[PDB]
Amino acid sequence: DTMKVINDPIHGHIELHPLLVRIIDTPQFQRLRYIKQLGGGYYVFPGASHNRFEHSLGVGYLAGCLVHALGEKQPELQISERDVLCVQIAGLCRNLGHGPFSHMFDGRFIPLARPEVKWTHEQGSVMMFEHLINSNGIKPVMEQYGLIPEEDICFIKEQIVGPLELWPYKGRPENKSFLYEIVSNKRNGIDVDKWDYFARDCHHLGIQNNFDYKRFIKFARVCEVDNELRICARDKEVGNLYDMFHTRNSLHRRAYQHKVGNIIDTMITDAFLKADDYIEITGAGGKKYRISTAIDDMEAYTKLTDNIFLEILYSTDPKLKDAREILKQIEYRNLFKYVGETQPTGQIKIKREDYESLPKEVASAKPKVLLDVKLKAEDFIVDVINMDYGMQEKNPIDHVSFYCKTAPNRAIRITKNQVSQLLPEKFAEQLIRVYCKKVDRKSLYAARQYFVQWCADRNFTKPQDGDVIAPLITPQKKEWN
Template sequence: MGRRERGRDRQRSRLHAGSLTWDSIPGLQDHTLGCSGLVLAAGRPPVRLRAVQAPRFLTVLCRARVVAMQGADSDQPFKRPRCDGSPRTPPNTRSAAAGRSSGRELRPDHQSWGPEQVCCFLKRSGFGDPRLLERFRGSRICLSYYNFSTLGDRKKLQACIQQLSEIHVDAMKVINDPIHGHIELHPLLIRIIDTPQFQRLRYIKQLGGSYYIFPGASHNRFEHSLGVGYLAGCLVRALREKQPELQISGRDVLCVQIAGLCHDLGHGPFSHMFDGRFIPLARPNVKWTHEQGSVMMFEHLVNSNGLKAVMEQYGLIPEEDICFIKEQITGPLETPIKDSLWPYKGRPKEKSFLYEIVANKRNGIDVDKWDYFARDCHHLGIQNNFDYQRFLKFARVCEVDNRKRICTRDKEVGNLYDMFHTRNTLHRRAYQHKVGNIIDTMITDAFLKADPYIEITGAEGKKYHISTAIDDMEAFTKLTDNIFLEILYSSDPNLNEAREILKKIEYRDLYKYVGETKPKGKIRIERENYKSLPEEIARAKPSDIPLEAELKAEDLIVDVINMDYGMEDKNPIDHVRFYCKSDLSKAVMITKDQVSEFLPERFAEQLIRVYCKKTDADTLFAVKQHFVHWCLIRDFTKPQDGDVVAPLITPRKAEWNNMDSAQSPDHFRERSKFKLRLFQDDSM
């Protein structure tokens, strides 16, 4: 028998004929390992590998881990490690010199390391779970106990613990997603998904009424939520791999994934139509957002399905981690005390970067956007210019104003501008499509008329309406897009008005689009003044133009749209920090003028669109004259078709006529007469 065969025999015997279990590592029995990766709970059955696989499994994992520990940012070419796990680094490189110096420091006393030195080594390597370290101290585990004699062996120990902590008795569920490919989800995520509260997202359209405009926009909140949960795990794991000193634990990874998965549980029928249009009109005194609904629904999901025990089984601490998950979705759960240093309770300030993954309140760069950019563009047929994979590659945590923030490489600033430009493009071409907004408005009108007559049973048999179901999560669980069909096919005479509006949508007999304008400069219409706009337009009657129809405010709908890069009129890149290749730990700011002269000067604008509920010719003619005259009075921009729909009004404002502004009043009178003749000819 050769030397290699004898070595394999000894290895197999040490592995108990191929059974690799937690019992194979003395001192780790019955220990919940939550230090890194996914969590194994105490008392779980042992994980076993076949005899042929076990030695190869350990060898491959340990060597791969040693190479990874050399540093993701190393500029040295990859070299296969030696048989003892030490890297094959050229002898004259800086990393080799560092290795030799560190080896001289460690080798003389490594066999005399006590439990405390071992704990310090594990903590520096990213294993900061106090329970693991306490177990090592309590059992007085030291390296000599295992007869490890080289630095390579010590690194193998670290790699084995790291990999074993991620092995599960319950297999990871694999889902084939059209955007991200085959994605793996943790068993706890599957338990959350397989509940009525989460499954309702299958029946809520991601883009609301846009499905009536874009036939491909049939996707729902369900698949978007799966994608966000997956991307949240990708980002937090990427940070953990690159920076073990951050001490990102398995609990942290799992909580971030759950927050991504559950961040949209609070959406109502037709998504943003519900909390953006319907609730403000149905309950104007209630300040309710879908993020608040998500937090309430998540708590209801956990309690009604008994998931606290399941969370504990997978190593979570419900009292702390449920709070942490909620905070990631909606921010601090309590109003922060003035001048308080840290408003969150789920995680300490040292892990502040974890709050920037699912819903980034600082600059808007988060995995929620990454998924809906890719998913919505895919279903809408719009080009997506942002590549989140590059952000994953270059993301690092740096110190910024005494907080740990997620930063990226300086060369990625252009990619981030592309991200916000993609957001703006999606809003202009899809989310704020003029016909899509008309359909959302009509559905809102139908829901408002049906609201008093729709009853939804909640907890303890109490009845709720569409607008009040947000107060009871059992009732809200039953409220989905299906309410549209319930009204449409109802025979209740109380729902006649609502039913007729929905029938108009089915027959494409929609409210008519009148026109669009926008305020000039920094002038903006404040939200509290939105309600008065239809009355203003109805009163803006041109004095010298005969109109056959009398316009009323209730005939008009004024839609005010705020277009921006996600932070109102601010440049979100001003709130992003970057690092340079020469110094990975120093965060720097990159100003707009350092990037390009072609970037926008302003990052927000307001669009004002007017629709008319009536469709007869006389009313439409009247409302167009009123609208153009109102734009002139308010000194807003001229509607694009203003010269066609109101040729008698547009010449009254010199700057609306481009090059004609310096010409005489006689010219305006002649031009007006000519346009009037054209208009009369067209109407004959």
């Protein structure tokens, strides 16, 4: 067979190798046509209808482009068509593990439905890749095009999820180390997945992005670092890398962590939780699985898509009413109402174990105002969001290697003070959002007082609309002045 050409609005005409086509034309991959990239963001940004499928295509194409560029600039690295096909495949397949509504599923649902297990979309991706390989007879096709299934499949999996366990990888030796920072870079977070979602998400949201990945590619080289071969970026591009991480953060604050989009994620998740017992998904040899257990059999997970949302919505079965009314309340646009936003202070970090107590703290309060309605802990929703640069408290650029024009083979490091004084002093922070499930005017007035007083009692940041929603409470805190 020959190569297929496909037109992507982001990257233009991309060439696809017959093996990649053979991987694409399977139920396991086509499953991604039915999973939205941004999940509930589509209920806020009407343009964001894009799915994981096209994003996967773009990641594969970009992986191929970067590996090919590095290959043509430096032939001494001995990159083969085999390495290219493999990295392209890893790129194509690192999104196979996503559940319905993407990050809502593994970031919100699974932790609440099955709090005893440890699940990540990466692991879902490796399992679904294995299932994909075996159920469709791919191995002989791999062999036809020059791959060695045992070494190569391993290399692909390690590319997607990291080591499956001194040099920890089995798929490629150290002098091809640079094959491992491309599809999913565990060292600093700079990888082609980000590059594709920057361009796609922006193309669809109606926000435009200032990061030029093609430029970074033009300036990328392979360097010798601590006796291994790593990707080196030209020194003069360090600023751009900072901006790359600034851009990411921006995309989170206007779009990915939008208050309403997130509360819609919470509502869909609660609906799914109240539908978890009554929905049956058919898995291996007829055996029956549930939404929360589908992650344990890939034949079941395969049939787990965004469609579940609609299954609940068009359902007539009375055991599903409680969830169905929630999903109907999304259609009528009767959402939980947003109360406000604040931040922790000092060295205070809201740890995961206390996310469960917070609505009670909010419901306690010491307000001192006409208390015409009482709110109980259940009436409050508290969302804690962690905003970082990809490596928690650390600075990712301290983990990137550079080269200069006078010596393009001398890898060097670059520190923050060498760049600018206008950069951040921190690289992680927490945001706290509070919502009230009671939408009436009196419940809102009250919820605001409870909220602000709660913020005062915890020595948190003063709400931006503090003087507004709580005029009688704000002069309680002397340092908010």
